[model samples]
Target: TQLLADKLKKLQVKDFQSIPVVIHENVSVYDAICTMFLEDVGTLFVVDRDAVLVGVLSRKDLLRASIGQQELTSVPVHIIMTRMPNITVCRREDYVMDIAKHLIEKQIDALPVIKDTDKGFEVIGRVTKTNMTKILVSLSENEIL
Candidate 1:
């Protein structure tokens, strides 16, 4: 029985990778790509000096930024990053089901997971479409009559 409530309680942002790869606002696109590939993540969180969530840069965003750019090495990620007030985010304690629905409704592939700290919103992890799919699959596999 894949109950929504049970899944939500069991699945948390903490269950995913914590201390996700982060890039400074002024980091160059060249560096961002290297980091993403090195970390083996599709998206990287952009944060300020205080580690507060600011924006996000996805692989697609990087690809788009690279297109027709003769000097991407010098271009700051801020120029291509999905800026604040537009990037979708989820709280560390938010229900996974709620986040999953939001991702589907918004047609986004990933979300920055944040938590309140003394400084402000800190990036805890990233929730990707694959994560949701995995959870759904696992739940179905364990379904009871």
Candidate 2:
């Protein structure tokens, strides 16, 4: 069998991609909250009309807004989202092992998956600690292909 060092080098983020629950940047905080619940996720990717990533949000953002004076239905997610250049993300080609390292090292719950196109980085999927856990559980039960 090949050494483990070279084996992980062959792994890529796309191999562990998770479907992202996306919402419009202008969507109401209340709406975003509902989406998060319906999607059973703690984090959300706030995207533009074309499904391009603009920002990221979590349930905490909506929870805070609910306690604040701003009208929940009137406030946009971007107002509470972690803005671009400030958000942590991963690309399709990133090493899955490396990505898992970041998730564990930083104690982050999720990461937005993006693709670098001629236009710009576009949010395509999401990755979370949950996904990583599932991978581990699967490997524990059976050897990886």
Candidate 3:
């Protein structure tokens, strides 16, 4: 029983993160909506010209933007997205349990796994509630090592 608990403590984000879904900051809310479906994702990372992580978009954010009754195509995601200093990010080396706590406290569905660089933080991967679910599944199956 405690075996799984210890394994959870040992696991890191790199062990469970998925490839991030990214969209340009300039992308319209219309296009971002389409991309979300095409990618089958609930969150989208917003990048600048340098492809650096600048903001984050969640389903709730898009839905709120849509309610404004403005033209979605004319509205860029950056205008509605949560910008840096507010965006919660994780690194590959971060502990899975730590990120799980963050997800719970922030009431967010996902967090971008970033890599720091001279330009800024690069969106390298993503960790979501689904990813945490997978961890539980693996634990139940005794597949975690």
Candidate 4:
């Protein structure tokens, strides 16, 4: 019944949070940390001057960079961002189930949601493990009599 219900209720990308927090590639690592703290988010999407999605920076990355021998104020986010090819992404039109599967298979905490526009890769949103957990909780609750 739950499986049938899932098929009946189509999930869309727009159902989740959209237009996630973005930072310029050249932004200072210190500034990024401040943004993270201010936004209350653990991740930040890195974009280029043209608004093309570049990479992602997690709180852990900044923490690691800070622990090493470098000045956080001087270090650029590009130096610590998880580069492309290593970064996982989900298209805007992708099914939520597929996105959930990819997150699980990759053992990743978050995925940068992108859309192919005339400009190039545009960051549309972010899919996190928490999002998947929330979906699961909702589905479970619906299944209860």
Q: Which candidate ranks first by lDDT, i.e. highest?
A: 3
Give each model's whole-structure lDDT: 0.81, 0.84, 0.92, 0.83
lDDT of 1: 0.81
Error of 1 at 144 (Å): 11
Ranking by lDDT: 3, 2, 4, 1
Most TM-score-accurate candidate = 3
User: Residue-wise lDDT of candidate 3 within 1-145, one digit each (tens)?
Assistant: 9995776687999889999999999999999999999999999999999999989998988889889878998998899899988888999999999999999998999999999888889989999999999998998898877
| Each prediction's RMSD to truth | 3.0, 1.9, 1.5, 2.9
- Can you write out model 2's per-residue Cα lDDT over 1-145, one digit (the tens) per residue? 5687688566788878898788999998989999988998999989888767899888777788889978888888888888887778999888878888888887778998988877676888888888788778877887575
The TM-score that candidate 3 achieves is 0.94
Clashing pairs in 4: none
Please identify which of the two predictions, 2 or 3, would achieve the higher TM-score against the true structure.
Answer: 3
The alpha-carbon deviation from the true structure for residue 7 of candidate 1, after best TM-score superposition, in angstroms, is 6.7
Q: What lDDT is reached at residue 104 by model 4?
A: 84
Q: Per-residue alpha-carbon lDDT of model 1 for 1-145, expressed as tens digits?
A: 6685675565665565344678999899999999998998888999988778889898899998889675988998888888888888888767677787888898888888888888998987778888777776877898422
Q: Please provide the root mean square deviation of candidate 3 (C-alpha atoms, Å).
A: 1.5
Query: For candidate 1, which ten residues in a row score worst on lDDT?
Result: 10-19
